[PDB]
Amino acid sequence: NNPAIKRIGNHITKSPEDKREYRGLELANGIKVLLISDPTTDKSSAALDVHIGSLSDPPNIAGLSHFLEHMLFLGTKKYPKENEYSQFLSEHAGSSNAFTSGEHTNYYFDVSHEHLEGALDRFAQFFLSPLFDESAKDREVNAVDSEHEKNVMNDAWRLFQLEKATGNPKHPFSKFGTGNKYTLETRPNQEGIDVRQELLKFHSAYYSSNLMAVVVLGRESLDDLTNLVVKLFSEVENKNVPLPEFPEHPFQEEHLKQLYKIVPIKDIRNLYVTFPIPDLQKYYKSNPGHYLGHLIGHEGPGSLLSELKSKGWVNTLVGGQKEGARGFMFFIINVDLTEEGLLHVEDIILHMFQYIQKLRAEGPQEWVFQELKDLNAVAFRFKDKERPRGYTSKIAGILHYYPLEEVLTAEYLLEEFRPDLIEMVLDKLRPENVRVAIVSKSFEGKTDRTEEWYGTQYKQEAIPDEVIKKWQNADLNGKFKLPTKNEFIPTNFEILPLEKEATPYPALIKDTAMSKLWFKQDDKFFLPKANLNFEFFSPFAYVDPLHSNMAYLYLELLKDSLNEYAYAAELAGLSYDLQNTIYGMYLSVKGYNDKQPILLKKIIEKMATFEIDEKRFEIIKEAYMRSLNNFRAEQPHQHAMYYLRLLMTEVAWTKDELKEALDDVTLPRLKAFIPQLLSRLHIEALLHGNITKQAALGIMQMVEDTLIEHAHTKPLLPSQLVRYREVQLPDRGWFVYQQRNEVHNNSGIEIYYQTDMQSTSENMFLELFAQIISEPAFNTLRTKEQLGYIVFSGPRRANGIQGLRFIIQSEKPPHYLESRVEAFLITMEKSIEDMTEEAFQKHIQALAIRRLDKPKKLSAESAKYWGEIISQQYNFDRDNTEVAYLKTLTKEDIIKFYKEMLAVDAPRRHKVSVHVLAREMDSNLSQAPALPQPEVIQNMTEFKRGLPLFPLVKPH
Ligand SMILES: O=C(C[C@@H](Cc1ccc2ccccc2c1)n1nncc1CNC(=O)c1ccc(F)cc1)NO
Ligand SMILES: [Zn+2]
């Protein structure tokens, strides 16, 4: 009966396993809405997607849409306090973010379920009368600048913008979307433009209700959620804006048959093949692009990748359709290159067209389409329950593209096989439509062009007629076959009954010298899935840099070897992860439980009986070398976190130590290493999901039996199972470690205040203190002082120890950042002494909500248990215990904690600082306190030698 509602879709197609309730509707002002009712959710959430993006930026103000997106957070007419939005979310267990693409601006938040209306109301205001405060504008432009600078020396962004720069300049596709101080402040000042008017002009003109989709999720009924949404959003004005479309492709004839040679920052070797194609979005019911991408990107036997990998030319391949905008898209084939591959780009591409030609010969395969359909069907039926925040943002995005009743299924289900469209798309993948780009350091000094925004060094050539002609005449290579029927498709979806002796938390159901087995039968989610987690402990995994390298290469080679076999299983919703740790090996198998034992057995056998291919060994090692080198190109704030991890751990091998020892890794030494590594192990496992206790025991026994039979594995001694300790810093100590980032012209800094061994009391002092300072830290260090885009504060936990950490990436020198953080702490000391008891309890409640938030999917709950197990703390009921203690803390308790552990003149202050200087830097408002002379760390080894080591935390 409501006049504010144009239409109400009551049957929203969902999965039969989804317990959440849905109602879609279209408001009178044209807003498409989806309501999600979940009476169990601990956090509520909303999201709004505007169908305008950076592609609609004014030509004279690059990055206006992105900039506008930052500004909406900084105040509205109804809520004028600059950080009201962020502070409210913080005080109620919430959080918020947004992003800008070429065609979308997407805003989202979550919050304690009891405060949805308050959050949603403050949120709705973003879209009616934001302030765009001139003072805030002048500040937040710096955050955007900082965000861009961060991307300037990043190879992904450089190539991203380079593609745009090599097509039609007249086309909106060529726009620089991020923006920076120049395009947002500096140039607009030369040209006398009022940026604040431009923000208001843009907001008013494009942020129309007809271009908006909204998704809200809470405990409230569908009826109540309707009243709430309608009340707040029907007030949004409808300017009846036409939806932008871009019918003309950014790549015209002059832009085809072109080759680009590009110099990267990292030492990487990549080949990009790109085919311009028509917008395939309408064909979404058949999805011709996904069909073709499925085949061209296949990694099993007979595939394009298989042959290229055997030729020793590539290691990995990506293929398929790539989004552009409304009216144009891309089909791409990207491979990485071996040293050999780099000298065979022409032959590689020939092989690409040979495979495409195979597809034309056989023509569309309906069983293939039918297979994809049925997998997606099963995928959708047994879909994991999503986290609200991401779910609402995802859906608010696609409401623009599908009927209300179809949004949930739209991105999952294939409906009708259309070979006519497949052939049509396949017809665009020809040499006369190709663009080729090669990324390699080998082009250094040989380029004649510069992209103006990032400065990328490149050369452009026309592909020779001879070569194009050669590609057009591609004969059928007998090495290329269509994929076989997927043998890993699951068939047994039976949910095993809950055993009588079943337990709420994992139970230790096996405890021998060989292995410690933790088991839980799923009692929450009831999907036909299981998680199998294994830690293999061995001293020889991390005993020195050389052996660390070999543990890595061992597992990489093993994965490279299994890829063809396991790729199918991956498509059938059964994946595995295998990586080396500082304690040995980690192996996880996740997915549909039906065929898990088959893949698991295959992996353990491959481990125990592995025969290294020498050609594969040389290639992977070479890549691993560059991998170590390329760390030089990581962000400063990452270098900072890295160096700190090195400093504070008992044992740690640096990139340089590893890279030197790499040269000494020969095939013989690796072949010797593996049987040595496997000879003595301890296995600690978590088996959690749709399995019974006997099944679990059976799985564990196979793993042991396989290792014993093929590798002659024997148990470790209990005395060999020592975990590493954390360096115990002296009272009132302050150490500083300094490094330079050779790639980036930003500086980084991490500050670590080491409190003490983890324990219920110490844990909750830190966590509560961190909760209280969280929002203020962001608002002060970034929003007010604008030190940088990346500003972070929070707990740090390692080796059973913990402390408070600040992480900042800035253009200012680290020694400056030091004072500002220190200045801030004093600000917080006074702020807390002032805050009301009611405000203090608010934070306690917020922290509690965050800690008690239930896991929504099996993998989240398993990760939670697994954390307790590898940490050797085994505190599975931790949350109830720790939250309960939390509620008994007082303001006076936290003040004592601060005055004793954290304050500048605290008796037990334990501070270490890592400073990463920018590329060009030199060696070195509220009032900042005076700081003591810091002990400059000259040498990590010398540093650790002079300090004691903490104990290890005792198990529960
Ligand atoms: O920049 C953006 C979105 C992010 C930028 C952003 C947000 C969070 C980050 C956390 C760690 C490191 C960098 C980060 C960068 N952004 N843009 N405008 C506001 C925000 C963050 N919004 C918040 O409400 C917030 C965030 C953190 C907090 F503690 C309290 C409130 N889109 O382009
Ligand atoms: Zn941003």
- Looking at domain 727-956, which CATH architecture does it have? 2-Layer Sandwich (3.30)
Rounded to the nearest whole angstrom, what is the distance from the C-alpha of residue 810 to the centroid of ligand 2?
15
DSSP type of residue 317: E
How far apart CA 561 and CA 318 sit, in angstroms, is: 18
Decide if 770 contacts 804 (C-beta within 8 A).
Answer: yes
Q: Cα-Cα-Cα-Cα dihedral of 334, 335, 337, 338, to 10°?
A: 180
- 296 in a labelled binding site: yes
Whole-number Cα distances in Å, 515 to 537, 607, 694, 700, 942: 10, 17, 16, 8, 37
How far apart CA 34 and CA 217 sit, in angstroms, is: 9
Decide if 280 contacts 329 (C-beta within 8 A).
Answer: yes
649 three-state secondary structure? strand
Ligand 1 pocket test, pick from 97, 774, 805 with the greatest ligand atom count within 8 Å of Cβ, gives: 97
| Closest ligand, as measured to the CA of 790 | 1
Residues with CB under 6 A from ligand 1: 70, 73, 86, 90, 96-99, 147, 774-775, 778, 790, 792
Tokens of 188: 């607009």
Rounded to the nearest whole angstrom, what is the distance from the C-alpha of residue 140 to the centroid of ligand 1?
12
Residue nearest to atom 20 of ligand 1 (CA): 97
Residue nearest to atom 27 of ligand 1 (CA): 778
Decide if 779 contacts 86 (C-beta within 8 A).
Answer: yes
Residue 423 CB-density burial (10 A; 0-12 exposed, 13-18 middle, 19+ buried) = middle
Per CATH, which fold does 500-726 belong to?
Cytochrome Bc1 Complex; Chain A, domain 1 (3.30.830)
Rounded to the nearest whole angstrom, what is the distance from the C-alpha of residue 798 to the centroid of ligand 2?
31
Residue nearest to atom 13 of ligand 1 (CA): 790
How far apart CA 877 and CA 891 sit, in angstroms, is: 26
Specify the pairing of strand 515-521 against strand 680-689. Answer: parallel
Residue nearest to atom 4 of ligand 1 (CA): 97
Tokens of 635: 């962000």
Task: Please name which of 620, 525, 535, 640 lies closest in space to residue 582, comparing C-alpha atoms.
Answer: 535
Calculate ∠ Cα 554-556-558, nearest 5°. 70
Tokens of 67: 């900039």
How far apart CA 612 and CA 633 sit, in angstroms, is: 31
Residues 6+ apart with CB under 8 A from 295: 359, 368, 482, 483
How far apart CA 922 and CA 740 sit, in angstroms, is: 9
Residue type, 66: H
Task: Please name which of 271, 157, 176, 186 lies closest in space to residue 744, comparing C-alpha atoms.
Answer: 157
What ligand 1 atom has the least distance to the C-alpha of 109? 24
Task: Please name which of 257, 507, 572, 296 lies closest in space to residue 422, comparing C-alpha atoms.
Answer: 296
543-577 exposure pattern, b = at least 16 Cβ within 10 A, e = fewer: eebbbbbbbbbbbbbbbbbbbbbbbbbbbbbbebe
| Closest ligand, as measured to the CA of 72 | 1
- Give the other-Cβ count within 10 Å of 388's Cβ: 28
Q: Which residues pair with 3 in a beta bridge?
A: none
Q: Which residues pair with 325 in a beta bridge?
A: 328
Task: Please name which of 399, 26, 30 lies closest in space to residue 208, comparing C-alpha atoms.
Answer: 30
Tokens of 471: 């590609």
**Method of elucidation:** X-ray
Where are the strands (E) in 741-800, listed by range?
747-757, 790-798
- Tell me if residue 69 is catalytic: yes
End-to-end CA distance of the chain: 59
How far apart CA 416 and CA 381 sit, in angstroms, is: 19
Decide if 429 contacts 360 (C-beta within 8 A).
Answer: no
User: What single string gives the DSSP state of each residue in 205-255?
Assistant: HH--GGGEEEEEEESS-HHHHHHHHHHHHTTS----PPPP---S-SS-GGG
448-486 exposure pattern, b = at least 16 Cβ within 10 A, e = fewer: eeebebbebbbeeeebeeebbebbeebeebebbeebeeb
- The HSE-up count of residue 535 (CA atoms within 13 Å, CB side) is 18
CATH 3.30.830.10 in the chain, residue ranges: 1-243, 244-473, 500-726, 727-956
706 three-state secondary structure? helix
Kindly state which CATH superfamily the domain 244-473 is placed in: Metalloenzyme, LuxS/M16 peptidase-like (3.30.830.10)
- The data reach a resolution, in angstroms, of 2.9
Decide if 636 contacts 809 (C-beta within 8 A).
Answer: yes
Rounded to the nearest whole angstrom, what is the distance from the C-alpha of residue 104 to the centroid of ligand 2?
13
CATH of the domain spanning 1-243: 3.30.830.10
Whole-number Cα distances in Å, 302 to 314, 483, 724: 15, 7, 46
- 857 in a labelled binding site: yes
- 521 in a labelled binding site: no
How far apart CA 506 and CA 875 sit, in angstroms, is: 10
Where are the strands (E) in 741-781, listed by range?
747-757
Taking each helix axis from N to C end, the angle separating 545-571 and 667-679, rounded to the nearest 10 degrees, works out to 80
Taking each helix axis from N to C end, the angle separating 116-124 and 222-233, rounded to the nearest 10 degrees, works out to 30
- 387 in a labelled binding site: yes
- 295 in a labelled binding site: yes
Rounded to the nearest whole angstrom, what is the distance from the C-alpha of residue 171 to the centroid of ligand 1?
31
Decide if 632 contacts 742 (C-beta within 8 A).
Answer: yes
Residue nearest to atom 12 of ligand 1 (CA): 790
154 three-state secondary structure? coil
Ligand 1 pocket test, pick from 778, 780, 789 with the greatest ligand atom count within 8 Å of Cβ, gives: 778
How far apart CA 149 and CA 157 sit, in angstroms, is: 11
Residues 6+ apart with CB under 8 A from 411: 398
Active-site residue (options: 17, 21, 26, 69): 69
